[PDB]
Design a protein around this motif. Structure first.
Motif, mmCIF file in Angstrom:
data_model
loop_
_atom_site.group_PDB
_atom_site.id
_atom_site.type_symbol
_atom_site.label_atom_id
_atom_site.label_comp_id
_atom_site.label_asym_id
_atom_site.label_seq_id
_atom_site.Cartn_x
_atom_site.Cartn_y
_atom_site.Cartn_z
ATOM 1 N N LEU A 160 0.823 -1.205 0.000
ATOM 2 C CA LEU A 160 0.000 0.000 0.000
ATOM 3 C C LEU A 160 0.860 1.259 0.000
ATOM 4 O O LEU A 160 0.439 2.303 -0.515
ATOM 5 C CB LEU A 160 -0.942 -0.003 1.207
ATOM 6 C CG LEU A 160 -2.092 -1.015 1.214
ATOM 7 C CD1 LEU A 160 -2.930 -0.934 2.486
ATOM 8 C CD2 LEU A 160 -2.970 -0.822 -0.013
ATOM 9 N N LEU A 207 4.126 1.442 -1.336
ATOM 10 C CA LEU A 207 4.704 1.570 -2.668
ATOM 11 C C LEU A 207 3.687 2.107 -3.679
ATOM 12 O O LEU A 207 4.075 2.713 -4.690
ATOM 13 C CB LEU A 207 5.266 0.225 -3.113
ATOM 14 C CG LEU A 207 6.510 -0.138 -2.308
ATOM 15 C CD1 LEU A 207 6.550 -1.622 -2.058
ATOM 16 C CD2 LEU A 207 7.763 0.301 -3.032
ATOM 17 N N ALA A 208 2.385 1.909 -3.428
ATOM 18 C CA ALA A 208 1.394 2.453 -4.346
ATOM 19 C C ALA A 208 1.406 3.975 -4.324
ATOM 20 O O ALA A 208 1.088 4.619 -5.336
ATOM 21 C CB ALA A 208 -0.001 1.924 -3.994
ATOM 22 N N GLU A 209 1.776 4.564 -3.190
ATOM 23 C CA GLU A 209 1.819 6.010 -3.093
ATOM 24 C C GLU A 209 3.140 6.582 -3.573
ATOM 25 O O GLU A 209 3.204 7.782 -3.862
ATOM 26 C CB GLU A 209 1.521 6.447 -1.650
ATOM 27 C CG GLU A 209 0.110 6.065 -1.187
ATOM 28 C CD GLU A 209 -0.990 6.611 -2.095
ATOM 29 O OE1 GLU A 209 -0.787 7.664 -2.741
ATOM 30 O OE2 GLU A 209 -2.065 5.982 -2.172
ATOM 31 N N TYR A 262 1.244 1.247 -12.655
ATOM 32 C CA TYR A 262 2.101 1.036 -11.492
ATOM 33 C C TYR A 262 1.334 1.136 -10.177
ATOM 34 O O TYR A 262 1.567 0.346 -9.261
ATOM 35 C CB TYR A 262 3.213 2.056 -11.506
ATOM 36 C CG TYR A 262 3.971 2.132 -12.793
ATOM 37 C CD1 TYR A 262 4.212 0.995 -13.552
ATOM 38 C CD2 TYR A 262 4.465 3.336 -13.234
ATOM 39 C CE1 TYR A 262 4.926 1.073 -14.730
ATOM 40 C CE2 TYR A 262 5.172 3.432 -14.390
ATOM 41 C CZ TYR A 262 5.410 2.305 -15.144
ATOM 42 O OH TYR A 262 6.134 2.437 -16.307
ATOM 43 N N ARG A 263 0.441 2.115 -10.045
ATOM 44 C CA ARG A 263 -0.365 2.188 -8.830
ATOM 45 C C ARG A 263 -1.237 0.950 -8.676
ATOM 46 O O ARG A 263 -1.322 0.361 -7.588
ATOM 47 C CB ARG A 263 -1.231 3.443 -8.850
ATOM 48 C CG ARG A 263 -2.045 3.661 -7.603
ATOM 49 C CD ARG A 263 -2.752 5.005 -7.671
ATOM 50 N NE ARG A 263 -3.674 5.225 -6.558
ATOM 51 C CZ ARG A 263 -3.323 5.724 -5.377
ATOM 52 N NH1 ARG A 263 -2.063 6.038 -5.104
ATOM 53 N NH2 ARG A 263 -4.262 5.935 -4.453
ATOM 54 N N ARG A 264 -1.897 0.543 -9.764
ATOM 55 C CA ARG A 264 -2.733 -0.653 -9.734
ATOM 56 C C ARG A 264 -1.910 -1.891 -9.430
ATOM 57 O O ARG A 264 -2.419 -2.855 -8.843
ATOM 58 C CB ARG A 264 -3.447 -0.822 -11.072
ATOM 59 C CG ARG A 264 -4.605 0.120 -11.293
ATOM 60 C CD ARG A 264 -5.502 -0.431 -12.367
ATOM 61 N NE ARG A 264 -4.872 -0.347 -13.681
ATOM 62 C CZ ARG A 264 -4.912 -1.293 -14.614
ATOM 63 N NH1 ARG A 264 -5.549 -2.441 -14.417
ATOM 64 N NH2 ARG A 264 -4.295 -1.082 -15.773
ATOM 65 N N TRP A 265 -0.641 -1.883 -9.836
ATOM 66 C CA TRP A 265 0.248 -3.007 -9.577
ATOM 67 C C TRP A 265 0.387 -3.250 -8.080
ATOM 68 O O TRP A 265 -0.001 -4.305 -7.562
ATOM 69 C CB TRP A 265 1.599 -2.721 -10.220
ATOM 70 C CG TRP A 265 2.636 -3.774 -10.008
ATOM 71 C CD1 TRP A 265 3.597 -3.789 -9.047
ATOM 72 C CD2 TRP A 265 2.834 -4.963 -10.791
ATOM 73 N NE1 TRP A 265 4.375 -4.909 -9.177
ATOM 74 C CE2 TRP A 265 3.924 -5.647 -10.242
ATOM 75 C CE3 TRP A 265 2.191 -5.511 -11.900
ATOM 76 C CZ2 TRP A 265 4.392 -6.852 -10.770
ATOM 77 C CZ3 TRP A 265 2.655 -6.709 -12.422
ATOM 78 C CH2 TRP A 265 3.752 -7.360 -11.856
ATOM 79 N N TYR A 266 0.902 -2.256 -7.359
ATOM 80 C CA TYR A 266 1.082 -2.400 -5.920
ATOM 81 C C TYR A 266 -0.247 -2.553 -5.183
ATOM 82 O O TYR A 266 -0.337 -3.338 -4.228
ATOM 83 C CB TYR A 266 1.840 -1.205 -5.361
ATOM 84 C CG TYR A 266 3.240 -1.042 -5.888
ATOM 85 C CD1 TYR A 266 4.217 -2.013 -5.646
ATOM 86 C CD2 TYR A 266 3.599 0.105 -6.592
ATOM 87 C CE1 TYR A 266 5.517 -1.852 -6.113
ATOM 88 C CE2 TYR A 266 4.873 0.277 -7.052
ATOM 89 C CZ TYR A 266 5.833 -0.697 -6.819
ATOM 90 O OH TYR A 266 7.107 -0.494 -7.300
ATOM 91 N N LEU A 267 -1.278 -1.789 -5.573
ATOM 92 C CA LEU A 267 -2.570 -1.964 -4.905
ATOM 93 C C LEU A 267 -3.062 -3.399 -5.036
ATOM 94 O O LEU A 267 -3.647 -3.951 -4.098
ATOM 95 C CB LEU A 267 -3.618 -1.008 -5.458
ATOM 96 C CG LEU A 267 -3.812 0.287 -4.683
ATOM 97 C CD1 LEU A 267 -4.519 1.277 -5.608
ATOM 98 C CD2 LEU A 267 -4.585 0.084 -3.386
ATOM 99 N N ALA A 284 -1.014 -5.709 -2.764
ATOM 100 C CA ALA A 284 -1.435 -5.584 -1.377
ATOM 101 C C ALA A 284 -2.524 -6.587 -1.022
ATOM 102 O O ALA A 284 -2.623 -7.010 0.136
ATOM 103 C CB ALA A 284 -1.915 -4.162 -1.112
#
Ligand SMILES: CC[N+](CC)(CC)Cc1ccccc1
Ligand SMILES: CC[N+](CC)(CC)Cc1ccccc1
Ligand SMILES: CC[N+](CC)(CC)Cc1ccccc1
Ligand SMILES: CC[N+](CC)(CC)Cc1ccccc1
Ligand SMILES: [Mg+2]
Ligand SMILES: [Mg+2]
Ligand SMILES: [Mg+2]
Ligand SMILES: [Mg+2]
Ligand SMILES: [Mg+2]
Ligand SMILES: [Mg+2]
Ligand SMILES: [Mg+2]
Ligand SMILES: [Mg+2]
Ligand SMILES: [Mg+2]
Ligand SMILES: [Mg+2]
Ligand SMILES: [Mg+2]
Ligand SMILES: [Mg+2]
Lengths: 337, 338, 337, 337
Positions: free
Chosen positions: A279, A281-283, B273-278, B281
């Motif tokens: 969560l 790394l998403a930011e 990239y955001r969707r990747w980590y989300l 998680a």
């Protein structure tokens, strides 16, 4: 609470499940670092071998696997320092002494750029080691990276003093879990370990990037991972040496938990660390390819400090030696009656 | 419209790590390049041109420790997926729903259906797919053989949607979500992940593989590939008159310029990239042993995306040597076009 | 005369290891191929044709752990060497002993003599050698600078002997040992080892380097490249009327067929392997420290020959994609004439 | 003579000078293999630990550096076997018992596919280990490879009986140098060790190539290099344990050499080993690329078995422990008063 065994959560899951990468210089640097730390401390044939079986070189070799030999040696030295250093606040003379504890911390922090004296292995063996490390760091690091090493060693020292306050203040079992985790995030030493590893790795992300809440949380997560793992593996040492700074002791003594329920909660927090990690790394914003290449290397470091500790925790002679492999294989960690 | 554009940084976030390229690249490339030239009857010129496509470079980053053998099958599959997909983009199947769906129906038949033994002479492209499938079958569990089928299916399915939209005048009426839904299939990343699970020797349990978080990872790798491709192969889709390109759709659907369309694509690449980590998680743990391989599979998703990235800037199929210059300078030239 | 020939196994003994290829090959190839293309004003066609010659492949095996920038440096040197040598084989200096000498003079003078700061515009080929020499000078000791110079001089010297044998009509009166003498210089392996010492960061003391054992290793590596080149560059030497090929010499002097000439070449190749090992037998020790680098140096000698070997069978300059088939089948087709 | 310290020859010259490559599976196979022999033999925490300090995994991890984890574990097992086995003939009950020594090699050779019982840790621990290694060898090797396995171990076993014959027949200091070396080429365990390495590396050259005098001599040299290096480093152990099988003891008490003049002879022999190595490789014929590829891997195994022993000798807790790194650095090896 005191059963013959406790069933350990799986600590090798998620981002800890990959095959660790161990610096190929491990053998050379262990040879140099183990013998040097023995001459410095004046360790005898049996005390020197006992330390060598602790194998702090395994720990550093996983933190910075492509570090060149000379820097890995430095990482070893720093580890021997922090071990010899931290024990002063856990079992040694600084445990119940706020005045002396603050004075050791002021004297150690002034080594890095301040008015400290030139130490020798005779004059003050542990401050000498840290000083020998600083000098090497200073000599190959930007002033900004040097500032980061200071400020992260400062976060460790600051909690050490909060550790000795809570100790003499009888707060060791009054503090809640958030208070305890807040303490250990510093007193676990991951924050300066990461700075050490940035030195070994040769990675210098810009302070502004470093300061982003995402990367600060990556460090925070890695510190939590080390502390959760450490309080499980080193729990018997905490019993055998009478140290209250262990989340298992805290959850039993404060929340009336059973040793098994305690360990279970540690497993909940460990996997909740993995959720926070992603969560965060998403930011993490992007700063273009060039820097992100090193941001990734940095994020790997935060991972490596935690997995390097995990694997080292399960075989170091300082905790359970060769018995930790059985706990790894069968999840069963035997306790003392 | 413009003579050039500034393309967004495509090498950020996770794409920024230094790629690893299979040491067997050279020996696998000299075999499989010669091979497909014999199968397809490439004269010297066309065979040299195809080597300069360097699909071996692509495969060598999907599975960097694949052994030479498996790596050659992978090059075989990529020469297949390229000769096959072109039939639907510029070839005889582009405006032919019936002929497309007979081709799809006969290629699927190769994977255990009532298909005959093809030969390079009888059917060259279907032959390569059969050779790949043979090799896949002989070293894979039945669950992975199925997975390979089901993932090719997702690609084949969108092929048929693509040709329906093409003839149905839908190319520039479809909204961006509809398009990305389409390209997720027609981009071939789902079959490529199955190809890489083969090359890398990673056999994740299907009840794990089916978790929405790994599904979302396959989905992000696909979007990443479709996004990077549309920006690179954009000159090809112009030269060859293919509408399936987010650039042309953003410019003709909404009234965006070249620069703004590629900027939009950059925004979407960073949303990937955001969707990747989300997604990561939400990925649960199945204990050390499985998670170890789960981690290898997540990497396979990334390496497909990153392998496509570095290859797209190298391939002669797109910009050739001037894709290196686009990586160096951010400037991607466009033709005068009038 | 024949439609083909069976080539002896050129991949045995020390050539039979799996080659290691610098993992910077792709990044270096992109820069250096583009670079030389701007320098020499190659158009789309000629540039891509030169890209298919893939001198980066060749360089990437001489020094497989050279950093990206030294690899580019070696690619530039290779592009030089090939442009440069072609002037002597089919270019203008081919039959001109005055112009050839003057060229050798002017080029040697780049290396710390009285050579003007060339430019792509003024003289491209000399521009490339000079860009190389600047980089070789900035990171090498004065001893290694001289060795680079001295080794190129052996190359340059035989070039002048070459043009003397072209004009003197002794291209086919000369013998094999005379031809091998010449080629040991014109083959360019002596400076290619200097280039590789630069690339691989290996700096053996000159009194060691000068030991006959190490000089016979260089002699062997040069023979290997020469024998390998003459087989694979054969079709080219027929196409471009070049007489310098052992294949061609063996058929004129000795009434040898194409097949038995290539077989002699195989016989000589295996003799190099024996001279290789016999020469290392004579190699004294200078202690672990130095020996560690002599061993790298011996490997560099091996890697030039082996790198040449794999590159010779892949490059578009000779047989292109057909070369791979000659390695798969041992059959090399010859021109009907 | 009985000096206070001897200056040992440079043992890390020539083909021993390279940076040794250590199997990355070292850490995992050690954790498995060390605990396993601990259980099989009933080692206590301190005996177990002292065995871990022997670090026989380090020794195998250099013999086959790319051996997969499971084969490295096997190699470790075999090494634990070899040491427990070899000590019975050096310090144990078989040291002086011709009948029982022959009955042991007879009961042990019959484990490799003969009329041996199915041993278990409890019934016969040491024979149990060899049996476990042999079942693995058989499961993944060809018949020809297994036969080679048996034949190389028989070379070890035979010389073990010659050793016990010379011990009791009072020939320990009558036997000349050649006799001593000819005995140790067997009792040093290098022949079965190479075989064990062919297994770990997955290298199966054909017996017709294997039997060639060049490769047989390569194995001989490997065997001498370990013997020479062993007798130097294990000299204090031989004194302290009263074992006459050591070239230093022989040279002094057989001829007229001091303990310094003794190592000197080791040094000339060690470098003569290097000479023989290259002369044997010069006589090694080519068997085409495909085969030669594996021949070189095998020549490497020969070298790697020696170079593995060399580095391990200077680290092992079995010989000098930490003080070996000092003897590597300085070349000074202290002796007891
Ligand atoms: C407080 C430091 N510590 C915590 C286990 C024990 C001395 C070692 C350590 C430092 C940094 C990272 C991991 C462990
Ligand atoms: C349509 C498939 N594709 C997409 C660019 C062109 C032939 C190749 C490819 C397949 C899988 C992954 C990446 C590229
Ligand atoms: C100098 C001549 N040669 C030989 C094939 C062709 C131009 C280049 C070369 C030099 C050194 C090593 C390998 C090739
Ligand atoms: C008898 C052999 N040795 C030391 C020479 C004692 C058990 C182990 C060893 C075996 C094989 C190779 C090298 C050392
Ligand atoms: Mg503490
Ligand atoms: Mg403590
Ligand atoms: Mg603890
Ligand atoms: Mg398409
Ligand atoms: Mg297309
Ligand atoms: Mg496209
Ligand atoms: Mg020429
Ligand atoms: Mg020439
Ligand atoms: Mg030629
Ligand atoms: Mg013994
Ligand atoms: Mg013995
Ligand atoms: Mg001994």
């Amino acid at each position: 609470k005191r059963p013959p065994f406790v069933r350990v959560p799986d600590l090798f899951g998620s981002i800890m499940s990959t095959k660790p990468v161990v610096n190929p210089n491990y053998f050379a640097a262990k040879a140099r670092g183990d013998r040097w730390i023995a001459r410095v401390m004046n360790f005898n044939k049996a005390v020197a071998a006992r330390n060598s079986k602790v194998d702090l070189c395994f720990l550093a070799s996983m933190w910075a696997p492509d570090a060149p030999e000379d820097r890995l040696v430095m990482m070893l030295d720093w580890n021997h320092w922090v071990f010899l250093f931290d024990d002063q606040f856990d079992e040694g003379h600084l445990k119940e002494d706020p005045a002396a504890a603050a004075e050791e911390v002021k004297q150690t922090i002034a080594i890095m750029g301040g008015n400290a004296p030139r130490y020798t292995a005779e004059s003050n063996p542990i401050r000498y080691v840290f000083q020998q490390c600083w000098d090497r760091l200073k000599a190959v690091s930007s002033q900004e990276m040097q500032q980061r090493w200071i400020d992260q060693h400062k976060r460790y020292f600051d909690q050490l003093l909060v550790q000795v306050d809570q100790q003499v203040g009888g707060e060791n079992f009054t503090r809640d879990v958030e208070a305890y985790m807040d303490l250990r995030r510093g007193t676990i030493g991951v924050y300066p370990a990461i700075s050490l590893s940035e030195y070994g790795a040769g990675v210098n992300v810009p302070q502004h990037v470093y300061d982003h809440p995402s990367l600060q949380e990556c460090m925070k997560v890695s510190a939590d991972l080390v502390t959760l793992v450490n309080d499980v593996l080193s729990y018997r040492k905490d019993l055998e040496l009478g140290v209250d700074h262990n989340l298992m002791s805290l959850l039993m003594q404060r929340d009336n938990l059973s040793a098994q329920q305690a360990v279970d909660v540690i497993g909940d927090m460990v996997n909740e660390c993995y959720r926070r990690w992603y969560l965060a790394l998403a930011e993490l914003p992007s700063y273009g390819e060039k820097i992100d290449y090193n941001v990734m290397k940095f994020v790997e470091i935060c991972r490596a400090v935690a997995q390097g500790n995990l694997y080292w925790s399960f075989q170091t002679g300082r905790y359970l030696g060769p018995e930790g492999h059985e706990v790894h294989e069968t999840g069963i960690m035997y306790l003392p009656p």
